[PDB]
Amino acid sequence: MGSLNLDSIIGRLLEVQGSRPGKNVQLTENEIRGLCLKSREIFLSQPILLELEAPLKICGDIHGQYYDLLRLFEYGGFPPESNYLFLGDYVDRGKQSLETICLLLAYKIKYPENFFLLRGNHECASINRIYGFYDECKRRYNIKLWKTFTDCFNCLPIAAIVDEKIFCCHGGLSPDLQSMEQIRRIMRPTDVPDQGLLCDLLWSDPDKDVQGWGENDRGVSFTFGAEVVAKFLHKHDLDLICRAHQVVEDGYEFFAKRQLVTLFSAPNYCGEFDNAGAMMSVDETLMCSFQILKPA
Amino acid sequence: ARKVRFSEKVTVHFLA
Ligand SMILES: [Mn+2]
Ligand SMILES: [Mn+2]
């Protein structure tokens, strides 16, 4: 005992759609614990390297901007009308990390074969301790719930391949990534290490000025140039890298002659940027199109 | 033999 009243939880999460943005949904602690526990089971039963098929919609960082998450579903179609892949960074920086991750977990549980969540670098206790999620849990619930989230985040998948052609991850490529089997061998639960394959997948960035690999300004992981992308795509017979992790003005931005695209789905990020958010739709023929969300 | 292609039809969503 007991079951999880998923439909009531989702109904309450969706209730505030159209209300003055910022209006909270305060689930019970056990409801949220239920969401973490049941989704954690689902994450572990599915591969850490997801293998997905189009059509699906792909979204980048949300960062607790819950009403922008709802807008994405509004324009993209609420599950299960459309399949979704999110590229991580659900929490921190925004005002409503809790509503955000809870709706995502809820949909993961309700539609486990049509709804998918990758791990971002903010789905990591050492990071979201600092940038808001801990403070939000502590304020609205307790630190024990925050540790329950950590335990759940530690089981998220870290990459996805869509129809053997699009490689998806939060950050980018790794100098340790030589085979896809190296990703599949990563055991869960796990924290995000300070270095290595898992770290790079959640932390690395493309860089125009770097030929091969370079030092990353974040002080973690690496930057990789257009050449690194071309070699990677050719080696694994892929057409595109789809990642997130960086705020871009129009919500999406191409790199290396459209061989890589960055998606960022949190419009006016932190209230400091004037960026749009974007969502990429991939149809059954792997035609990719962008919906852009201008900030409210 | 499917290949990734990009639509030039971009949809923008505003709030009036
Ligand atoms: Mn982010
Ligand atoms: Mn990130």
Side-chain angles (χ1 to χ4, degrees), chain A residues 1-19 21-22 24-94 96-207 209-210 212-256 258-271 273-283 285-296, chain B:
Chain A
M1 289 186 112
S3 292
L4 182 61
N5 203 342
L6 201 50
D7 289 326
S8 166
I9 290 170
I10 287 173
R12 266 176 288 139
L13 285 167
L14 295 191
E15 215 164 64
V16 298
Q17 194 182 356
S19 301
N24 280 351
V25 168
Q26 186 76 12
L27 302 178
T28 76
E29 163 178 337
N30 286 342
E31 282 167 347
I32 297 185
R33 278 160 45 67
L35 293 173
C36 294
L37 167 65
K38 300 290 182 181
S39 68
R40 186 189 196 269
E41 284 170 26
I42 297 172
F43 293 141
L44 291 175
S45 61
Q46 294 181 340
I48 190 174
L49 171 65
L50 295 177
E51 282 156 327
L52 310 176
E53 297 98 61
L56 73 173
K57 320 249 175 192
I58 310 180
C59 303
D61 308 13
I62 307 299
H63 278 304
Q65 298 183 199
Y66 183 59
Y67 284 79
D68 287 313
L69 177 57
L70 295 180
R71 288 223 285 151
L72 288 172
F73 287 139
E74 182 189 343
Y75 304 132
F78 279 85
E81 178 184 330
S82 308
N83 290 8
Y84 283 86
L85 169 61
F86 286 82
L87 301 179
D89 279 10
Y90 314 115
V91 304
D92 291 346
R93 294 295 201 189
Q96 292 180 283
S97 293
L98 280 168
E99 288 85 349
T100 300
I101 190 58
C102 289
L103 182 57
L104 295 175
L105 295 189
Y107 274 145
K108 182 51 186 165
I109 303 158
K110 220 244 186 307
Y111 310 111
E113 299 296 321
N114 295 278
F115 195 88
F116 298 91
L117 302 177
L118 300 192
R119 188 176 196 175
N121 56 307
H122 282 260
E123 279 71 58
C124 170
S126 64
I127 298 297
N128 66 39
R129 168 62 184 86
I130 300 170
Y131 295 106
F133 188 46
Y134 170 92
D135 293 327
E136 196 175 329
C137 289
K138 179 159 180 280
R139 174 177 53 87
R140 289 180 58 185
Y141 292 95
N142 49 62
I143 63 147
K144 190 141 83 179
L145 188 62
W146 175 68
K147 288 173 181 177
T148 296
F149 272 114
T150 288
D151 186 39
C152 181
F153 294 162
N154 290 350
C155 297
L156 287 165
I158 65 189
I161 303 176
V162 185
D163 289 305
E164 313 185 7
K165 290 301 179 183
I166 304 177
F167 183 84
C168 307
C169 65
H170 184 63
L173 304 177
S174 176
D176 284 326
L177 182 52
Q178 277 165 295
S179 170
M180 296 302 178
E181 195 56 34
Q182 291 177 302
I183 301 179
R184 307 200 172 92
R185 288 192 210 104
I186 296 173
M187 301 299 296
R188 291 171 293 170
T190 178
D191 194 19
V192 182
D194 300 327
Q195 70 286 303
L197 174 51
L198 174 46
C199 172
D200 299 332
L201 283 167
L202 271 48
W203 279 98
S204 67
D205 297 299
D207 195 313
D209 304 322
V210 163
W213 297 96
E215 297 188 310
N216 194 313
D217 282 338
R218 298 173 194 266
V220 188
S221 188
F222 305 93
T223 57
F224 55 93
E227 308 183 14
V228 172
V229 169
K231 283 183 185 178
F232 180 81
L233 293 182
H234 182 79
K235 182 176 178 185
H236 303 286
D237 199 25
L238 303 163
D239 294 320
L240 171 76
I241 299 165
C242 180
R243 48 85 70 163
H245 187 52
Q246 272 177 313
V247 50
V248 296
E249 192 186 2
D250 291 321
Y252 73 101
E253 193 171 278
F254 290 118
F255 180 74
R258 293 174 151 186
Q259 290 181 105
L260 181 148
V261 68
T262 294
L263 305 178
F264 196 87
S265 301
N268 192 218
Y269 181 50
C270 298
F273 299 84
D274 303 311
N275 66 286
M279 168 172 39
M280 183 174 78
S281 307
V282 192
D283 64 30
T285 69
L286 298 183
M287 170 67 74
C288 296
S289 47
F290 302 95
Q291 293 176 259
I292 290 184
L293 287 65
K294 285 298 199 210
Chain B
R2 278 175 308 168
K3 224 279 187 180
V4 172
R5 297 148 305 138
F6 295 103
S7 176
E8 67 274 42
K9 319 278 176 56
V10 178
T11 303
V12 186
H13 300 275
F14 281 90
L15 290 192

